[PDB]
Amino acid sequence: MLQCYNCPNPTADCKTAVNCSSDFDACLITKAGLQVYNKCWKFEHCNFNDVTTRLRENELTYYCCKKDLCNFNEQLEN
């Protein structure tokens, strides 16, 4: 298992640590406008097409990693 911060809805400070299911091999943190997403994710989906479409967001920056709780917000700039 990989541990990630994971919140089902976007929020300013997601600190809910989850033990991701085995289908997830990465953590994701995305800043889309004023919203922030933190999710258990899949490396295969660490690209603009898969992030934008799944979150239904247009403009965004994303950061994927594979270390426990690595998807903290400060991984991305303002």
Swiss-Prot record:
Potent inhibitor of the complement membrane attack complex (MAC) action, which protects human cells from damage during complement activation. Acts by binding to the beta-haipins of C8 (C8A and C8B) components of the assembling MAC, forming an intermolecular beta-sheet that prevents incorporation of the multiple copies of C9 required for complete formation of the osmolytic pore. The soluble form from urine retains its specific complement binding activity, but exhibits greatly reduced ability to inhibit complement membrane attack complex (MAC) assembly on cell membranes. Changing F43K: No loss of function. One of its GO terms (molecular function) is complement binding. It comes from the Eukaryota. Changing F48E: Almost complete loss of function. Lysis. One of its GO terms (cellular component) is focal adhesion. This is CD59 glycoprotein. The gene is CD59. Disulfide bonds join C4-C27, C7-C14, C20-C40, C46-C64, C65-C70. The chain holds residues 26 to 102 of 128 of the full protein.
